[PDB]
Amino acid sequence: SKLRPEMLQDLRENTEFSELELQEWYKGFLKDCPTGILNVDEFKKIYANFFPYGDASKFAEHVFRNFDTNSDGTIDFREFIIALSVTSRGRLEQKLMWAFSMYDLDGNGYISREEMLEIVQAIYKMVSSVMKMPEDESTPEKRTEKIFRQMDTNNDGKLSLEEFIRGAKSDPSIVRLLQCDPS
Ligand SMILES: [Ca+2]
Ligand SMILES: [Ca+2]
Ligand SMILES: [Ca+2]
């Protein structure tokens, strides 16, 4: 029905959403999902609005796994709203931290080529049908080639968090963003 005063204050501290926005999200989340529990099939349907269902399936599964921080197979409102807050309203530093953990498939603290390519392939499959791409990065192999060499500092075939944040900052989309710095 409505968020309790204790949960509302905990979510206030853990998100960048206002009290009005938090209450507005909770009713809509409960409307769109009566049980308060998002499974993979429902999550795939959300993503199916923006890109074709079959194409988006593999990447949608990987995102769902990162959303699910307690790894129990479902997403509650807290796990949804915190994950949505970081991705849409979080700082660039902490956005990349949330991203790093998604690429880290086994959960050791390192991104191998077997993991990095797998996520890149999943992005390319979803994107292919409506987005045209460049040319020197127009292959999942061409992409993972550019990434690892620009990031793997000590060349152990693995990517640490510190390598990830620094290496991603040279991305064209972030290059545009950094010119909008207030100071
Ligand atoms: Ca969960
Ligand atoms: Ca790993
Ligand atoms: Ca390394």
DSSP state of 111: E
Obtained via which technique?
X-ray
**Closest C-alpha among 86, 111, 121 to residue 162:** 111
Q: Are the C-beta atoms of 47 and 34 separated by less than 8 Å?
A: no
Q: DSSP states of 141-177 as a string?
A: HHHHHHHHHTT-SS-SSEE-HHHHHHHHTTSHHHHHH
Non-local (6+) Cβ contacts of 61 within 8 A are 40, 44
104 is in an annotated binding site: yes
Angle of helix 92-103 relative to helix 113-127, nearest 10 degrees, comes to 100
Q: What is the resolution of this structure in A?
A: 3.0
DSSP state of 109: S
Task: Identify which ligand lies nearest to the alpha carbon of 101.
Answer: 2
158 is in an annotated binding site: yes
* Cα–Cα distance measured from residue 17 to residue 89, given in angstroms and rounded to the nearest whole number: 8
141 is in an annotated binding site: no
41 is in an annotated binding site: no
C-alpha distance from residue 134 to each of 55, 59, 128, 140, 172 (Å)? 20, 21, 12, 12, 12
Q: Are the C-beta atoms of 100 and 164 separated by less than 8 Å?
A: yes
Residues with Cβ–ion distance below 5 A, ligand 1: 68, 70, 72
* Cα–Cα distance measured from residue 48 to residue 54, given in angstroms and rounded to the nearest whole number: 8
